[PDB]
């Protein structure tokens, strides 16, 4: 049961820390994925241009 | 995409106003060009200059 009790508190432990990576990695995703549709943004103004 | 083409839609608008006084004026001289030009196509075409 001690031992149980300490997977449980490890795997929200690292339930925590994947979370984290988790959103760190979908930040710069998003931030990315931002970027090139601003490139799109860009070039679809020029071409009307 | 609406950015670019109100800007688009802007520059068509001054373009038919400006380009519109330049057809103006471009007129006014191809309506004293007429005379000439209408001489030179009539001797063309009868022959023997006149």
């Known amino acids: 049961l001690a031992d149980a009790d300490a997977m449980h508190?490890?795997?929200?432990?690292?339930?925590?820390?994947?979370?984290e990576k988790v959103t760190?990695?979908?930040?710069?995703?998003?931030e990315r994925?931002?970027?090139?549709?601003?490139?799109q943004a860009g070039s679809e103004a020029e071409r009307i241009k | 995409r609406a950015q670019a083409s109100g800007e688009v839609a802007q520059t068509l608008t001054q373009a038919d106003q400006?380009?519109?006084a330049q057809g103006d004026q471009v007129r006014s001289g191809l309506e004293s060009s007429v005379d000439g030009l209408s001489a030179?196509?009539?001797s063309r075409i009868?022959?023997?200059?006149?």
């Open chain 1, 9 to 19: 508190a490890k795997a929200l432990a690292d339930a925590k820390a994947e979370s």
């Open chain 1, 24 to 30: 760190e990695e979908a930040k710069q995703d998003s």
């Open chain 1, 33 to 39: 994925i931002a970027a090139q549709l601003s490139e």
């Open chain 2, 18 to 20: 400006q380009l519109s």
């Open chain 2, 40 to 42: 030179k196509l009539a």
């Open chain 2, 46 to 50: 009868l022959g023997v200059d006149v």
